[PDB]
Design a binder for these strands. Structure first.
Lengths: 125, 148, 258, 193
RNA sequence: UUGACCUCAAAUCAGGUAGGAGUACCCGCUGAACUUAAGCAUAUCAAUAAGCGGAGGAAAAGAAACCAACCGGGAUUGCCUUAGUAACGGCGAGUGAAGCGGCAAAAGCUCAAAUUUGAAAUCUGGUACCUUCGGUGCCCGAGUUGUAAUUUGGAGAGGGCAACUUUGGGGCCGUUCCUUGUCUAUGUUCCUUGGAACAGGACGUCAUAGAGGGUGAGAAUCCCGUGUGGCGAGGAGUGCGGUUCUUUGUAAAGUGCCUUCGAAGAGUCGAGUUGUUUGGGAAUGCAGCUCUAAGUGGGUGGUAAAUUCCAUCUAAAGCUAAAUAUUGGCGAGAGACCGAUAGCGAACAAGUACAGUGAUGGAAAGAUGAAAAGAACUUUGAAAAGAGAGUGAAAAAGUACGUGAAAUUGUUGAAAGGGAAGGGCAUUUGAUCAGACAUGGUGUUUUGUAUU
RNA sequence: GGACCAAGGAGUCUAACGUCUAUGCGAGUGUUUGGGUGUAAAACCCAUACGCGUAAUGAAAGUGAACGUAGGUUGGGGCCUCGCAAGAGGUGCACAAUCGACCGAUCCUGAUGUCUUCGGAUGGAUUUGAGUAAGAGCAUAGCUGUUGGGACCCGAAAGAU
RNA sequence: CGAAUUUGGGUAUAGGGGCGAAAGACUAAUCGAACCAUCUAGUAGCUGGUUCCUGCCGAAGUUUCCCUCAGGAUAGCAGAA
RNA sequence: UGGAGGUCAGUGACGAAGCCUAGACCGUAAGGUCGGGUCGAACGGCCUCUAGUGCAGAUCUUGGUGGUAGUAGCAAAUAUUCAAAUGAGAACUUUGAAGACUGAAGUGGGGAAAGGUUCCACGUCAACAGCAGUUGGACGUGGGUUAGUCGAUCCUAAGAGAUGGGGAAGCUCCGUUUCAAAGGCCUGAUUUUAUGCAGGCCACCAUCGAAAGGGAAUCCGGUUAAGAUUCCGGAACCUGGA
RNA sequence: UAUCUAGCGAAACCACAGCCAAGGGAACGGGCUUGGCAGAAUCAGCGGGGAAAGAAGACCCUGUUGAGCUUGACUCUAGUU
RNA sequence: GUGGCCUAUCGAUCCUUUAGUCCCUCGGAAUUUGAGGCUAGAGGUGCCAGAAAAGUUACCACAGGGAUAACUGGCUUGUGG
């Protein structure tokens, strides 16, 4: 159970904070776990998901489907992954959004800042 | 609690226990002590005689500390002695070894003689004493010393 | 206090073919002409609005509190009362359950669970773990979302990691012998909490509550005396002392005559 | 309004009493705040005892005449007899009360003894010394408790001569009551040639 | 004639300052009536609402012209109590404090009245310089109709005898307060249901972390967090333990003994009267008017007065934290509260739409689905749209969308229907339906070839 | 009064109390103003006071409860003794009648002693008290009843700012 | 129907007040005292309503006093303990 | 019946709650339990605690719905008809013809107050025009208002209203030249310094108040879908400057 | 106009309803009792009944409910002297 | 013999005023005034268990009342016929 007086176990306050989180905090909220291989290589459990990250779906109807992120829709609290879409009646392909908690990250888009973030979290590249 | 009240049982009966003829009206006899000399005079003269009028003389700025004087009776006098030594004092009943009781220390102002202390002598320090209490203590073989 | 009264509604009186309740004035609103200021009225004030000077805390005599605490402590040592209270103590060798002060000195949750398994409180633990269910009403969105049973109460004398070690394991409570809440000793006013004492706690019980040879350490307190010398009134009734003076009885079921 | 046999109750609720209702929901919160304030002051004045040294004084009236309690501050005479200036005592933590006098040798002596005990029990750090920390206690009042005097021993000898101790009271009351008329009578008997 | 001084002006002179908001709490003024008295006028409501002026984070009060009558206490405030009491009151209805006692918090003080008189030692501003919440020069100004030091009644001032004990201002290092930032464990393994597993089952792991939230359903272990620690950044830094320039060199305060003194607030105390108020009662406070002081004098000592004493303080000048208040503001945490006719009027583009000339009045209105996947295409219609088809777990979710009640209605089916209908008892008729029969038991014809 | 239907809709809470009841302790009783401590509005602990009770009476000054086995008489449940079943005696709590005694008030009598007008012993009286006469109370809770409050809910004509 | 005429705009008078060739007329469909908000959930011995079941018991409209006569107190009748 | 403490290691996406069902059982009853349909995420038994706890009425409240009832009614202002066009559709739109009316204190042409885009064009008919609609002051999208001369602006009227001053606890009231030391206006000074001054004249009572009062000055012709005494062409006038 | 048709389309009111005679009854029934009687569904009229609708009688009385006005009512008061 | 031969012939609280005790209090203590208490009368409430009280409303208002008048109906039929 919680100890400190600054953390609130109010369901209402927690839900309000989540649903009115700005995009900067939604970036952390949309963190995703790395694969077993990536976790072994880096030493990182989960990272905030990015735009050019390579992931695999491990939950839902598209379980076991790989792809590169097409966008990180923080407003919609989801990520859109290339090759995870739906074909409509008219033949148009609309992206299928899904939550980063249900992906596994199989290849990170590394920048200077992403590499520094890995070192900060304690990684080894 | 609310579930034990007769309001829970009056649910379904029209008048809620207040009558159909004489209803539960707002203040059908006055508010408070109204009409205590006119139409509640019967209740006053039955249950509270002496309610109306004034008798004594006044006392502007009366302080009860002036009249603080708790009364201790002789039959309760010996409880002011600690019970560890009370038996020893009673058994070794003699002068020149009498227990000393500070009734003011106990918190009393006057000693009254309600009866039958034992024949054990005792020195009792009292702010005020009564005549009978004094005679009873003298007969028991002790003394009352006035204090302040 | 201003709910239902933030209107300037006035009664229309009789002669207008409507009830005499106060009505909102004005026009062009959809609210104008509507009833106000009544418990029967939509948007009006409730009957007898709830006040904060209602009595919330209720006083209890210190001696009655200590009587209830002593009764709960004594019920913790009745094997049948703990089972009726539902505490999965069938596998326990005997109760009251006393464990060494090394339990007071324990440090980790894993070894706290190991100690519970060793002494037989684990069954109570799985009861609490498998009793977790959603609340059955509007109490979910009042920060009371889940309900679960009450596990063992580990009562200690000194805190050396026992509290933190038992803190995370679900349903186990930890208490000091000095406090020993009735709220934990008889939850729901049901006697017979399953209590695991430490050795130091068990020995401190006599000093903190008194005995026939030591004083209570609560000044002016002594353990209550019973109205009766024993609860075995059946033994008293069937003793020879009473049966000898008792006259012969009938057949325990009167035969129907006529 | 008035009905069966009941006491006459005087419930003063004819004003807007509901606006002036204070219910102390913050009793526990205010206790926590007070304890926090005491801890904060202790850390702020760390070695100091969180309260001044008060004197022993007598309760005023005749009802409470028996008790002896804690006063506001020591008399200037008391602090002089202890051997220090009022300003210095105020400085090193002794409550000094100017307006209280001492017409009582026993109370004066008891407060002198309290001052001497305090001076023996405290250590005053130098202004530019080595700061010898001294494991602060948090209560001058707890370290120097008020103790009631021992007015008499447990047992004595009966000294009885026969004044009855009630004739004494009656005569004292009578003397006080009739003093003035007696003075007037003597004045007339002396002014009559 | 030339220079002041006094008083009064003017300036788009130099620099400031006030207004107005919000007012929950706070300080005052003004001020009802409804109401109660079973009528009503005194009274009550109420020294309240409305009205007006003025502050702060608290305000106010506050170091006795006190309480008390005791063996006396000792600034103020608040709580418990005193106490529904003393007292007031058509002594009716009603109203109604304070001392003591226990506690929380505690903190003290400073002007006026003194000759620096061997030195206006005081201060604003301009102009310079600088280490700029300021300092140091110089220069006019203010001020002698009194600015500094010195003293505030607890005292204290001079005059003598000894000749003791005692520091200042600013940076730096860390306290510490505040605003934060980041890092810090453990399954998404197998099987069933399902659209989705977050459900059930098996095996596990972490736990000082099994609070809470999110994720396609009840998720400690999927994510954010949580728990325990670590590591940073910035502001304030004189609640404080150490270095720095290290001392203006007669650069600066307290104490004992004797003497002489010892200034202390005026249209103010006080008295009378009038009005109001108070529990204050031959008058509690306040205010108007009239009179109007004194010097061991003056106030008080809760019954008016004269004479005689005691007790207690020292007014008519001022400052001051904390304990106390707080339906406003800004941050937080919570609840045996409410759950969209409830809870704020407002869960929504709510003080919105719109009503009134105006003051003001003032709503209704939440829910597709996990995801629009929001229905391609065909066909009939002018089209709306229908019929197919299609998506979806579901279209018995199609935007007029969760569930979809009742009143009320359509269709179908069944019944009755000579100026109501409905109901009770009882049967009849039609419709509809539950309740032993292989089953614990009787003994053999062992069917679907431990068992019948 | 009611065309119909749905939802909402009316003896509540509080301060102070009466009776009764349950409980704890009991001549005492009540921790919770506050302090200590806490797994933090819980729980647990701790005083000094204060409230109520243990003394009444009188306007007040004041005085203040055993002539007795804490009295006598009548009645008393229960217990004790007794004739094998009837039936006597003894003791008799509570309680109810009655006669007393004690404390206060009122009206008298006023003894030694005198601050010579104080004192108030002793004795009394168709008087009187919410008294004594081997204490019962204090806290908490519950129904019911009372009063002030919006006061079971809705309802004026009015009055004031 | 050439005037004590009719009328626009501006302006003045504001609620115990205005204004009135006077009807208590008019003062924003409001007038023998406008409208708005508040005191205010004003008071009502008066009218209306007052929400589940079963079981047991079960009345009074009479006495006395009351500015009392549509209402109370009191005694009675009733329940409960 | 809502919520709370315990417990059934209770029921449940393999279907909780809710709802519908002249289906069954149980209880005298309040009610409880179950079969079937619908639905899709929570809920119940027991021991206790708690209350904003049970409706048929209150000319109750809010919302919804009826019978009446396809009923009253859609009848003032003389009145319409024929044919083409458009259109799915024409009594109602457009055009042509006829018949009429207003009849110049108009049913005409313009303005004031008020409105606010209703003006005009294009597209369009779900709602609105109490029938209809292809039409519209409706809906959607856009376009449009051009000034030295017309107004405002300036003046003052009844009046309103600062200042000086005086009341009032005060919000504010009076007062408008009053018991005021109340300013701007002519020409030289006029670049050893300016707009200083020994130049000179005087002495108003702020200000606001009229789109009908008083006032400086513009006319014609043409022009747009919609503006024109405002644009263009021509022809003038006034004011203030040099 | 009413009327019939196309389109369009309300409201009052409504416990349930809608045939009478007598009886009794809150003393003038649609319902109850006893008789008369009694056949779908309806259209236009009509004004006998529904003690028809419209409004918590505006007359009268009661209330210890007002208000406007008056006066040598009681108690005050601005002004004035 | 404790007023009238008997049955009638009268009056609270608060306030005032008398009589008596020479009694109690004025709360820091005399004393003397004054004031306040104790007990009993008197000053009065006739609406007589005891408010301090003029009208009008044909301009009117509210809560109610068929507890109550002004029609019908109903019982009675003095009176009328």
């Amino acid at each position: 159970a919680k100890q400190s007086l600054d953390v609130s176990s109010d369901r209402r306050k927690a839900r309000k904070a989540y649903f009115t989180a700005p995009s900067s905090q939604r970036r952390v909220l949309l963190s995703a776990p790395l694969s077993k291989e990536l976790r072994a290589q880096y030493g990182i459990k989960a990272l905030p998901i990015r735009r050019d990250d390579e992931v695999l779906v491990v939950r839902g109807s598209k379980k076991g489907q790989e792809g590169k992120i097409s966008s990180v829709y923080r407003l919609k609290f989801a990520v859109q992954v290339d090759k995870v879409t739906k074909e409509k009646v008219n033949g148009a392909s609309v992206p299928i959004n899904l939550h980063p908690s249900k992906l596994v990250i199989t290849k990170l888009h590394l920048d200077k800042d992403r590499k520094a973030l890995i070192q900060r979290k304690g990684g080894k590249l | 609690p609310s579930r034990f009240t007769k309001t829970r049982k009056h649910r379904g009966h029209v008048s809620a226990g207040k009558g159909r003829i004489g209803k539960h009206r707002k203040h059908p006899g006055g508010r408070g002590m109204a009409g205590g000399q006119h139409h509640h005079r019967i209740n006053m003269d039955k249950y509270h005689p002496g309610y109306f009028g004034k008798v004594g003389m006044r006392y502007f700025h009366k302080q009860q500390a002036h009249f603080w004087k708790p009364v201790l009776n002789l039959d309760k006098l010996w409880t002011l002695i600690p019970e560890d030594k009370r038996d020893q004092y009673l058994k070794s009943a003699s002068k020149e070894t009498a227990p000393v009781i500070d009734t003011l220390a106990a918190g009393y102002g006057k000693i009254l003689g309600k009866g039958r202390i034992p024949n054990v002598p005792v020195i009792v320090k009292a702010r005020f004493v009564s005549k009978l209490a004094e005679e009873k203590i003298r007969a028991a073989g002790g003394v009352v010393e006035l204090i302040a | 206090e201003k709910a239902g009264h933030q209107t300037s509604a006035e009664s229309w009186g009789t002669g207008r073919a409507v009830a005499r309740i106060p009505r909102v004035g004005g026009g062009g609103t959809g609210r104008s002409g509507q009833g106000a200021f009544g418990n029967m009225c939509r948007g009006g004030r409730m009957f007898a609005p709830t006040k904060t000077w209602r009595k919330w805390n209720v006083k209890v005599n210190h001696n009655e509190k200590r009587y209830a605490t002593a009764s709960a402590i004594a019920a913790t040592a009745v094997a049948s009362l703990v089972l009726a209270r539902g505490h999965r103590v069938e596998k326990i060798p005997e109760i009251p359950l006393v464990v060494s002060t090394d339990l007071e000195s324990i440090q980790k949750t894993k070894e706290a669970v190991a100690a519970l398994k060793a002494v037989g409180a684990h069954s109570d633990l799985l009861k609490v773990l498998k009793s977790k269910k959603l609340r059955a009403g509007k109490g979910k969105y009042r920060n009371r979302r889940w309900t679960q049973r009450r596990g063992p109460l580990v009562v200690y004398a000194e805190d050396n990691g026992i509290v933190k070690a038992l803190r995370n394991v679900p349903g186990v409570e930890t208490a000091n012998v000095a406090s020993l809440n009735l709220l934990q000793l008889a939850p729901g006013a049901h006697l017979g909490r399953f209590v695991i004492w430490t050795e130091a706690a068990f020995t401190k019980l006599d000093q903190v509550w008194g005995s026939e040879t030591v004083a209570s350490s609560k000044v002016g307190y002594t353990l209550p005396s019973h109205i009766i010398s024993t609860s075995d009134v059946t033994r008293i009734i069937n003793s020879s002392e009473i049966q000898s003076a008792i006259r012969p009885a009938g057949q325990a079921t009167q035969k129907r005559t006529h | 309004a008035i009905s069966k046999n009941l006491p006459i109750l005087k419930n003063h609720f004819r004003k807007h009493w509901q606006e002036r209702v204070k219910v102390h929901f913050d009793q526990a919160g205010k206790k926590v705040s007070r304890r926090n304030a005491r801890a904060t002051r202790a850390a702020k004045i760390a070695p100091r005892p969180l309260d001044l040294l008060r004197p022993v004084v007598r309760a005023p009236t005749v009802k409470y005449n028996r008790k002896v309690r804690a006063g506001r501050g020591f008399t200037l005479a008391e602090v002089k007899a202890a051997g220090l200036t009022a300003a210095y005592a105020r400085t090193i933590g002794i409550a000094v009360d100017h307006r209280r006098q001492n017409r009582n040798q026993e109370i004066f002596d008891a407060n002198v003894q309290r001052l001497k005990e305090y001076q023996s029990k405290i250590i005053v750090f130098p202004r530019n010394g080595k700061a010898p920390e001294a494991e602060q206690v948090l209560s001058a009042a707890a370290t120097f408790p008020i103790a009631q005097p021992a007015t008499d021993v447990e047992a004595r000898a009966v000294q009885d001569n026969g004044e009855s101790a009630f004739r004494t009271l009656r005569l004292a009351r009578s003397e006080k009551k009739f003093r003035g008329i007696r003075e007037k009578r003597a004045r007339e008997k002396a002014e009559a040639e």
